[PDB]
Amino acid sequence: KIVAYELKTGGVLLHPIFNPASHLHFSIKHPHTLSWEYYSMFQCKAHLVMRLIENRISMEFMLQVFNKLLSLASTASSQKFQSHMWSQMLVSTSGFLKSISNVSGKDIQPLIKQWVDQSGVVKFYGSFAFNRKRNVLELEIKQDYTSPGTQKYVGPLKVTVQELDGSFNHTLQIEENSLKHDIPCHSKSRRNKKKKIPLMNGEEVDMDLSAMDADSPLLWIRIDPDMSVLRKVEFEQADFMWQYQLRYERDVVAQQESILALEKFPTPASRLALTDILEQEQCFYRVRMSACFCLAKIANSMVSTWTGPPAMKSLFTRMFCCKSCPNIVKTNNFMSFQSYFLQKTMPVAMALLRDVHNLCPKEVLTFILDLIKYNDNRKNKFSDNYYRAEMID
């Protein structure tokens, strides 16, 4: 939301100094002259910058800062002196930074100078190349700092590389003149023997390594995984790396960004990846709800190649319909709250299917109308208004 708004119009400036922001058509000196979208993005950017301050100075020290502010205010709140002490209930920026420096011993003045006083987000364009001879991974990260909303980042940058030997984090120092970052790569001895490949968490899984390159061990790369800067990343992986990142990652933001990047690769391996995500309980439900729409877009792009039925129809009849009647939907029992959301989002994405003539097929429209006719809600303890409203959608 904030990178869309700041690249759209100028930027949000937390803590201005009194104009400080002349790129935008109102004055930021008073709350009653702000646009309402600017007020909303102001609150949004403020809580993300506080998450960044928690990233630099750990969460227990952050809660100690907040407790110190509240405790000064509550010793202030019981005095009777007319504001000799009632102004300890008012916080400022300098007092907040001083309380942070009191509890932690680190000051955050570079982070405050970059993300508060400066009003911009950063844009990262990354591309990699694997050097087989020296066994290194040559990243190439360049910033677009000449757009109207952008600024230049010179700090450190975390990158997480999943190779066959596991998941390794690397810190890159991205100075102004930097372009190529050579990080080292590990072995490929988990392709010699079939062993399980260890993940970002402690677990390990069986991966189908037939799509991987023979010479490179690395399975996927993520630039800034923890969202530790206010950034927009445009990484150029290979399509099998996006499919591996969709399947076997233990991070929902990486699964979402792989869904978002698989729309450019309409190959049938990506259709298999999104269909395996859709069938998979123990995936987070908002990833499967995105995989519905991604599968609809991919299915629209590979018409005159699609083999069987329309997308997600057989999957809908496998998950939510009767075993004896495929075209009759099961009676509504909405007590699971994840297959309820997936059930009410799957025909909405299924209706975006189009034939070679650019008209929605009469197999999906008939399916949606049979979902509407055979709807029986006399048996669940929950209402049907959102599911029926999504059927109209």
Partner: protein, 52 residues
């Protein structure tokens, strides 16, 4: 085998889940269509098309 002995018969029962779902669905759709047409005809009405 019929002169002196008699046993009763019953009507054919339709215990099929498919046709029971179809019967309940079509009866619900027909009664709600009849109700909404009756209530739109005996009151103030709107129309998506001109004089419809």
């Amino acid at each position: 085998p019929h002169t002196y002995i008699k046993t009763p018969t019953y009507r054919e029962p339709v215990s099929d889940y498919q046709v029971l779902r179809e019967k309940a669905a079509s009866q619900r759709r027909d009664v709600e269509r009849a109700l909404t047409r009756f209530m739109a005809k005996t009151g103030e009405t709107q129309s998506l098309f001109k004089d419809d």
